[PDB]
Amino acid sequence: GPGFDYAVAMAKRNIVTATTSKGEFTMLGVHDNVAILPTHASPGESIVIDGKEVEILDAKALEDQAGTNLEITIITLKRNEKFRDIRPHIPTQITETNDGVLIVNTSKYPNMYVPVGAVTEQGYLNLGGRQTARTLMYNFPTRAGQCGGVITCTGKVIGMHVGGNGSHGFAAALKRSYFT
Structure with missing residues (x-):
């Protein structure tokens, strides 16, 4: 309010805390079960979101039209929770x-x-x-x-x-x- x-x-x-093998990161939910993280966070098959292990259904690394890295990875999560x-x-x-x-x-x-x-x-x-x-x-x-x-x-x-x-x-x- x-x-x-x-x-x-x-x-x-x-805005939640995410833990991958590379440590703790701030993560931003964008909509529904879709969030973003820096590509170098390198999340594997699952990720720990605020203390809870959650499965990644999809992890798309973005790049521009020339193939250059944007450093943003969009992850789709296996969870009823909604941003x-x-x-x-x-x-x-x-x-x-x-x-x-x-x-x-x-x-x-x-x-x-x-x-x-x-x-x-x-x-x-x-x-x-x-x-x-x-x-x-x-x-x-x-x-x-x-x-x-x-x-x-x-x-x-x-x-x-x-x-x-x-x-x-x-x-x-x-x-x-x-x-x-």
């Missing part, structure tokens, strides 16, 4: 903002909000030996525990944190077409 933005309402149901449909709040185009907020939800940082400032288009990035397209950057001392963090601005969900270099944080841009 109360919440400085749409973000607060969505967060309670759609709110946030798609109407995902822009149809890569989106910058002067006032972004990063939302992280892990056991080390439960339901935490952090205004990060300007979020602008970085474009191609070398993400751990792999070329990644459509990235965004923000000036925030990135560290462990933020992978999967969601990036929002007033009424919109615009990126997902996928890496960072000491002074900057990088995210994959979200676009609506990826989910329809």
Whole structure:
């Protein structure tokens, strides 16, 4: 109900903690039983969501038209649980903002909000030996525990944190077409 933005309402149901062999990540539910995670989280046949082991029915790694990695993996879960449909709040185009907020939800940082400032288009990035397209950057001392963090601005969900270099944080841009 109360919440400085749409973000607060969505967060309670759609932002959960996911555990794969590579550790804890923040994960974003998009609609129904469909969620997203950074491709490098590498979920196997199942994943532990908020303490509960759940089976993955499908895991689609996204790439652009040229075959470049987007670093977003869409996973379809085997579970009656249903996320709110946030798609109407995902822009149809890569989106910058002067006032972004990063939302992280892990056991080390439960339901935490952090205004990060300007979020602008970085474009191609070398993400751990792999070329990644459509990235965004923000000036925030990135560290462990933020992978999967969601990036929002007033009424919109615009990126997902996928890496960072000491002074900057990088995210994959979200676009609506990826989910329809």
